[PDB]
Amino acid sequence: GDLKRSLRNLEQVLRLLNYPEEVDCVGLIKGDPAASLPIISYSFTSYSPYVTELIMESNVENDLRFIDAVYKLLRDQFNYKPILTKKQFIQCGFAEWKIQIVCDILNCVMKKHKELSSLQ
């Protein structure tokens, strides 16, 4: 857990994703899930038309179900198992690890888009 490293990884990843919204810096540092969910949500709904078509085809979304759906999506479609459990993510703490999971999810979305746009 290195807060500075994780935040710098997120800045670089948000830059590559062209995330257009303002980021809740205070919430991320405090490990608040509410600061991570809008970023993950944006990458699923608004980043790529190919990634978003795949996601909207299976599951549909108060975000207690949102965390469960994201975990199932990452396991099935992106072959990603987050480091924290579903309850370690919903509870406050492990801030550096939640930040890196956002970076990982966003890297999965972007590598999935590059792969899907290729075979078209």
Numbering used by the authors: 4 to 64, 69 to 127
Question: Which passages does the manuscript contain on this structure?
Answer:
We have recently determined the structures of the N-terminal Calponin Homology (CH) domain of human CEP44 and the so-called Spd2 domain of human CEP192. The N-terminal domain of CEP44 shares a weak sequence similarity to various CH domains, most of which members of the IFT81/NDC80/Hec families, whereas the Spd2 domain retrieves sequence matches to members of the PapD-like superfamily.
The comparison of the experimental with the AF2 predicted structure (AF-Q9C0F1-F1-model_v1) revealed 116 residues superposed with rmsd of 0.74 Å. In contrast, the CEP44 experimental structure superposed with related CH domains with rmsd ranging from 2.8 to 3.1 Å. The predicted AF2 model has very similar or nearly identical backbone and side-chain conformations and is of comparable quality to the experimental crystal structure. The CEP44 CH-domain structure revealed the presence of a highly conserved basic patch on its surface. Mutation of the residues that constitute this patch abolish the CEP44 microtubule and centriole association, rationalising their involvement in microtubule binding. Even in the absence of the experimental CH-domain structure, the AF2 prediction model of this quality could be successfully used in cryo-EM-based microtubule docking studies or for further mutagenesis design aimed at the identification of additional CEP44 interaction partners.
